[PDB]
Amino acid sequence: AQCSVDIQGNDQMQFNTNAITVDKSCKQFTVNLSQPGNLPKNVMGHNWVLSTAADMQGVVTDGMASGLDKDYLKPDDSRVIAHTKLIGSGEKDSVTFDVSKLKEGEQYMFFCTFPGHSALMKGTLTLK
């Protein structure tokens, strides 16, 4: 609602939303991530990473190779527009980015880079 959304990854390896629309009138957008289940981050840790639909596979491939030590994301990956940290059960993290970094007409995807999760834990983001 407004320029923010609350997203949560769960023990079923699913996100509560698979589509986000950021209104043109937002200077910034905030994503508050929560993990309501009871599984440790090493078994079911989730994060929210945003890139272009085109960069999704690269980020996911380089990400799952970095280990949970690096939250399953290549450090200083340029394709990642914004991301949360990798959290487990009971944790929460928020990320805020400037809407100036998104152009109308392009397709973005948000996803979880923890091994295998991106199969279900993905979704669309669009600036309208």
End-to-end CA distance of the chain: 14
CA–CA separation, 125 vs 54, rounded Å?
13
- Residue 106 in contact with residue 52, Cβ under 8 Å? yes
Contact flag: residue 80 with a second copy (CB under 8 A): no
Asked if residue 83 belongs to a known ligand binding site, the reply is no
Q: Counting contacts by CB under 8 A, is residue 54 touching a second copy?
A: yes
Question: Which regions of the chain does DSSP assign to beta strands (E)?
Answer: 4-8, 19-22, 28-34, 49-52, 82-83, 92-98, 108-111, 122-127
Name the minimum Å distance from CB 26 to a second copy: 20
Which residues contribute to the site for a second copy (CB under 8 A)? Answer: 10-14, 16-19, 36-37, 39, 42-44, 53-58, 61, 64, 68, 107, 109, 114-117, 119-120, 122-124
Binding residues for Cu cation: 46, 112, 117, 121
Which residues contribute to the site for Cu ion (CB under 5 A)? Answer: 46, 112, 114, 117, 121
